[PDB]
Design a protein around this ligand. Sequence first.
Ligand SMILES: *[C@@H]1O[C@H](CO)[C@@H](O[C@@H]2O[C@H](CO)[C@@H](O)[C@H](O)[C@H]2NC(C)=O)[C@H](O)[C@H]1NC(C)=O
Ligand code: CA
Lengths: 296, 183, 642, 119
Amino acid sequence: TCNKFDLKVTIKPAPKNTMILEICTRYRGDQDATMSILDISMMTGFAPDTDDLKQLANGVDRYISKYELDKAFSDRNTLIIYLDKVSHSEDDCLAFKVHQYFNVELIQPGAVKVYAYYNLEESCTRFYHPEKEDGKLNKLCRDELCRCAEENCFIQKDKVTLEERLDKACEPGVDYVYKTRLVKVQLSNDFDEYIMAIEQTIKSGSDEVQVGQQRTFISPIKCREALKLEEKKHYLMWGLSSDFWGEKPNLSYIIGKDTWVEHWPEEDECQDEENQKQCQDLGAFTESMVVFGCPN
Amino acid sequence: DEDIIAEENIVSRSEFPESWLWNVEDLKEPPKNGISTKLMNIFLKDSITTWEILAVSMSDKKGICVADPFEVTVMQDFFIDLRLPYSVVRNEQVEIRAVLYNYRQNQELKVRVELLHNPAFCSLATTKRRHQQTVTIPPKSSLSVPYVIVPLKTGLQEVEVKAAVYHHFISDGVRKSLKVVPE
Amino acid sequence: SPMYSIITPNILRLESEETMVLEAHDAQGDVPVTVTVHDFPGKKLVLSSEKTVLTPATNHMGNVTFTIPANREFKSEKGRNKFVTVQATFGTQVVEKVVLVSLQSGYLFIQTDKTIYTPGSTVLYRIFTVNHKLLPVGRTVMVNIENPEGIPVKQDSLSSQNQLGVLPLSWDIPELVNMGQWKIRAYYENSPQQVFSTEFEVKEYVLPSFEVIVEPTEKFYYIYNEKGLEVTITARFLYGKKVEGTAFVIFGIQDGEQRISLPESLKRIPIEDGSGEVVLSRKVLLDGVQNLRAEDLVGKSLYVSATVILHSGSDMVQAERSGIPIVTSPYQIHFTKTPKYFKPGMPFDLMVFVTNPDGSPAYRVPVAVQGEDTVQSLTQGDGVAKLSINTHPSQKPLSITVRTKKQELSEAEQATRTMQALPYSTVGNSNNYLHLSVLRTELRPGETLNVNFLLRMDRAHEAKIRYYTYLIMNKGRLLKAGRQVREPGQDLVVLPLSITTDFIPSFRLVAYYTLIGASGQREVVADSVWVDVKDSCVGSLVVKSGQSEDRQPVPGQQMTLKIEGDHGARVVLVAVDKGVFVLNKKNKLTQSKIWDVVEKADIGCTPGSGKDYAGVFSDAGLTFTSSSGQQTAQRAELQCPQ
Amino acid sequence: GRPILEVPESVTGPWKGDVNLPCTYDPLQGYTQVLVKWLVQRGSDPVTIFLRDSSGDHIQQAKYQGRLHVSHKVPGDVSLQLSTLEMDDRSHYTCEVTWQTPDGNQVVRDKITELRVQK
Ligand SMILES: *[C@@H]1O[C@H](CO)[C@@H](O[C@@H]2O[C@H](CO)[C@@H](O)[C@H](O)[C@H]2NC(C)=O)[C@H](O)[C@H]1NC(C)=O
Ligand SMILES: [Ca+2]
């Protein structure tokens, strides 16, 4: 809880890739706080407008140091705006242009922190980001504990030759291999839900699941469109032991960077000059696993 | 990359006691002008700071004597200062700065900094993709590098960051603990 | 008819050696002496040991050196004060004295490796067990860890026996724990009523990367200074480099414990090249108070608070300087080192102590008596100047006023203090006196010191004064006693006394002569002087970069420390990161703390002289007793009057 | 008599610049110099910053490393030179010399100067 400060921070696109950062702060116990500090860090590969800063600094009530001003666009990822005061009658709001100068993937949330000079503990910190809002990193929590969802949606992508499948499913902790019909797709905001019914166990393991039984699969919301699954349809699924969720007999599975999810064409739909190869190979994959069993 | 020390070959400074050399000797070696001399060999810890060494002596004939403080400064041209807080709450997001310093008198340095990955922390660092920036630090100057993390496990957990400079055999690592607290 | 006399200390220590000083005056041939110690009321004899012989070969001045041991009888009348009867038999004649005893076995000193700790960390501490000469002793000690609300939570009982007076002990601070000022509390088993403590703080923190020093340009504030109060902020990295950043400084007035902040004083300055200045305006200060009269602020103090944030924002730190006194003068004058008794008709020496308002000595500062023109002397490094006035032979109490006469200052800026002195009363109005003097110089061991014995008595009896008896008290025990010879006609004579390390941190010279004057009147005349040796260790100790000299070492690199000190001595070490001291720097163990404890334990209460002879001896910490019935009055109080 | 130290009551120096605190004595027979010591009065009371002996020169407080030098040419000259004065250097400095007499005993003389720093 932000005991002594309300902090509201937004990032919005400009009316290579510049943006508008808006900082809205005010303080609790309605006589204005004295000298206060706004400590701002940038999104990886962003820098403020030298002008907008000089603009902010020159209007009295606020101070931005010469040392911060003489800094280069080359390396200015932190920044401190000093405020002569901040009450709560309203919100004291400011905004400046942040320019991207280094196009790298992912990009890390920025952060804003407020406090008065004479007490650092009593502070408020909000994180900002374009594709996440409120800046929170993709985690996946139930009850008490989280998992880092910031990672690949599932073993990624074109040729998928028989070796490539037969090989990749005998690595470290490949604990299960199922053919699955998808029985219900319980969407939601925070985390998705895919009830897969196990059509057969190709490789069993750390979970004695019987054929006909259903198992829930969780996946982050930001993966929804990339997985793009639909009910009634069959699948192929790798997965590890470190991917489970909750105690026996109620063991939920998680889809992460290490899981293989593959669309399996239906029985009659196999006979098509576009699904010819995949159907044969997925069929070949099964028998090699059943009759032989990873010749490790 | 080219002309930079590999991440695996960088050994991270880790021993950061607030206090040490809590330690006893007797001046046994025979006197020379009433004065005995001991030579103590020590290993200095990893902190980049100034140790204030203090000695008290107790003597049958001469009693109790408190030496004057003698300071030792431990120092490097290039190094990281990982600035962690004392505790962090579980599943709450925090920023932590990893400041980089440069004291070469007339030379800037290309540096590749990096946050390491840990199962106990959620951050852009994952087991198969590194989380490295590449910054330029002007001479007689420092740079903050902000890393955002989310603490998952409880108890005493470890944040660690490394840095290597381009075109020089210079580099540093730091491994500090912080405390993870339940809800 | 011979007078047998005996001098011992006002209070006597248990289990330690003490000296009792035998004399027969106007005696003939060998006069053998037994000396016995019993407990007081209801007797059982604790030291019958020690007899001696008084010979003309030594002009009948001997000593017996005894030790009273601890007994069950000394610990079965607790809460009230212990006592003994000290009994000398000079052949056949007996002289006795009841003498206070103390169980105070010596001192204890507690050392903690840090000044501030966090929950989950261990406290490392040592206890130094010494006696009243600061030598190591093996005794049983009781040790308590005490939490911020006053509760024992760990107890311990150790013996520093075979341990070179060092007791290493530790305590693990639990994870769930009361933040605040914890306490360590040690005392000797035998003397539970004397407790030695140390604080340490338990807090949640991380070490800062830099340090902040906030210093006023003058060590005080003068109310007539138009410029206000100049303060310098110095910020510096703990590895030695300078700091760039921003500082918020803010001032406040303190009156006793009432802290009244001055919000209108708050500034925000840049710290460039590790430095920055800031002034508290005199207008702001006077307008921050409601009493507003500028002289109503004299005696209060000013404090400054600085927060410094680096331009990185990645770390900040706070620092405060306190107790900047508001003064009308840059000086104070003290008469704590001047005896408060004069000898009518003789000179009166004055040891004026001049301090700066924070209490430190003011080197090379002139002082003079009010009414005296010309008559001035400069103060020494220890901030004491000597002056002397001639006193008129009446019993009229002396009222002395001393001023600073420092050029550069106005006259309202000069310091002043007044003191009164009473006349030493002689036996039957005989006007017989003795005056000891010493030269004004900072005295170190190794030096020779000339003690002047000046006589003053009628010519009709002076020819009988063949010798002066003198004694040297140091650290509450008798250190040395001898005779200073004198031949008839001599008024002044000098004892050339050699100052050894045994004289630290200071000492008393008491001296006396005796005769049969006027009638069958037995007369004692005494005087004493308090002399201040320069403080330092008795031996020495130095840690230095043993690896000969220079360079700045790298993290984890090997290096050689060179410890140098007294042969045989046990040396204990600690290395503390200077960051700790940025958070907390209170109660660190210091050699000048040790002496300051030692001088606070003094059984002498007066810088010299007295109302009479029996006053002279007792004020100095001594008992005098004789077969003619001349004696010091009973001392029953274990502590100096106040 | 024993040797005698000469040290100015005060010295003044340019901020950011250099300064010299003179400490000189006329040598005497039977008085070997065996130790030089400079202390700084850290407000309360004093703390050894420099140290010269048979072994060599010794800086015993880190804020002086690099900035501190004590004359060593003319016998009798043990003056102290600080470089790059910081406001924090403002303080009392004590020069203390220790001689040995042929029999063995040591004798000590010291003197205090007040260093000032002018902006
Ligand atoms: C009590 O008795 C003797 C006098 O003989 C003193 O002890 C000796 O003192 C002389 C110097 O005056 C030394 O040469 C000896 O080494 C000492 N011997 C002993 C037995 O310790 C002693 O100082 C006298 N007590 C006092 C305080 O005067
Ligand atoms: Ca002293």
